[PDB]
Amino acid sequence: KCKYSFKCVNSLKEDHNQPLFGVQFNWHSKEGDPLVFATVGSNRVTLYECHSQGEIRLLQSYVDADADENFYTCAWTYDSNTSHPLLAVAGSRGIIRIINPITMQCIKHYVGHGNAINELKFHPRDPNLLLSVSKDHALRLWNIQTDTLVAIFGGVEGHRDEVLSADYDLLGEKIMSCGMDHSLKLWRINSKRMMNAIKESYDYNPNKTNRPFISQKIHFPDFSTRDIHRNYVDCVRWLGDLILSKSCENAIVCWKPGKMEDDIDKIKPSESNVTILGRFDYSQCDIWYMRFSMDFWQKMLALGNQVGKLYVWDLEVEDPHKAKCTTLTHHKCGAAIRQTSFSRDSSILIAVCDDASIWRWDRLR
Ligand SMILES: COc1ccc(CCN2CCC(Nc3nc4ccccc4n3Cc3ccc(F)cc3)CC2)cc1
């Protein structure tokens, strides 16, 4: 048996009855402050608090003025200067909105992607750098302090189809992206070119020059493979220097570029080998856009499937690809679980569903 046990303590359904596509705990809150997570779906962004006796306390909602916006994803950050939390959301309109979670009002917004945005990620060491991933086949790195587009990752050897997912490594030196073209691509952002681009993006003063700020066009990833999956890749995360990624073949694959002994930071762009370490098998999760998540210290891996089962794997264990997961089911939870989120201390796991239901699972302590 997996050593991580959870009990379902609460559930609720949102009034709009549309699929909830994203859920994110805020990992930037004080160990003293209450645990807060956001859900997104329809034209709605909703905040909830977790409290004693399994309560899920509704805090506040944001409804977009555009009735036909469809939010797919959200990401937390904080303002460098005020230390106050900020929430980025985006979806089918390709517009990035920054919401003030205290007032739940839109502060500013970025247009630019020519199509839907499927994922948002904030740099783990610079909270002002937001990465967006788009159906126009590109990734974009924004500086939301100076409202500038730093770089566009796409072109000659960028993705050939819609990009679905991306993730920064531990320190934010590199990005792995993936999408409908079956490929996984690595983009290093600690190169001198990207370092200078990031620095220039901070020095940009509009009321001090008339020349617009030109984004760096990054056309060549630092590594690319289509040898991991045989179909689209709808989720990728770094596991240390290893990569976890999934397609619609009912497995998360753990792999790394190069040969097994090869250091990630010496992989050249022309590297043709990958090493598959193993896979996490499951069933009934072969529909498009089902995301997996890990806890802060990457001791646990969670994936929901299309009939409401929630798998949790212990990542600390020997022979982890052959170990049985914990399967969490509730007889009232039958809809597809789109994304899950662990609280900062791994005490809570929240799942959100295609029928607008939210499920709260508490780790037995
Ligand atoms: C917020 O800051 C932090 C700081 C640290 C961390 C932990 C990173 N973690 C990353 C994974 C590490 N395992 C690990 N590397 C390996 C390298 C080669 C071969 C096997 C390896 N295996 C074992 C393994 C392989 C596959 C698998 F599916 C499970 C285990 C162990 C360390 C998280 C957040």
Tokens standing for residue 331:
């007889």
**Ligand 1 center from residue 224 Cα (angstroms):** 22
Place of tokens 């690319």: 224
Q: Is the CB of 320 under 6 A from ligand 1?
A: yes
Q: Tell which atom from ligand 1 comes closest to the C-alpha of 240.
A: 10
Give the residue, by CA position, lying nearest to ligand 1 atom 20: 277
Q: Is the CB of 172 under 6 A from ligand 1?
A: no
Resolution in A: 2.2
Cβ of residue 298 lying under 6 Å from some atom of ligand 1: yes
Q: By the 8 A CB rule, do 128 and 144 touch?
A: yes
Percent helix, strand, coil in the chain, to 5, is 5, 45, 45
Give the residue whose CA is nearest to atom 34 of ligand 1. Answer: 297
State whether the beta carbon of 323 lies less than 6 angstroms from ligand 1: no
CB of 239 closer than 6 angstroms to any ligand 1 atom: yes
Tokens of 186: 């690595």
Q: How many residues are given for the chain?
A: 365
Sheet holding 117-122, edge to edge: 117-122, 129-134, 139-143, 148-153, 216-218
- Residues 149 and 215 sit within 8 Å (Cβ to Cβ): yes
Ligand 1 nearest-atom number relative to CA 254 = 28
Burial 205-236 (b: 16+ CB within 10 A, else e): eeeeeeeebebbebeebbbbbeebbeebbbbb
Q: How far is the CA of 361 from the centre of ligand 1 (A)?
A: 25
Is residue 14 within 8 Å of 62, Cβ to Cβ? no
Approach to solving? X-ray
Structure token digits, residue 56 = 């899920």
**CA of 124, closest atom in ligand 1:** 1
Copy the structure tokens of residue 4: 């991580």
Compute the distance between CA of residue 324 and CA of residue 312 in angstroms, rounded to an integer. 9
**CA nearest ligand 1 atom 31, residue:** 240
DSSP letter for 317, please. Answer: S
Measured distance CA(95)–CA(194) in Å, rounded: 24
Sheet architecture: strand order including 300-304: 292-294, 300-304, 310-314, 326-328
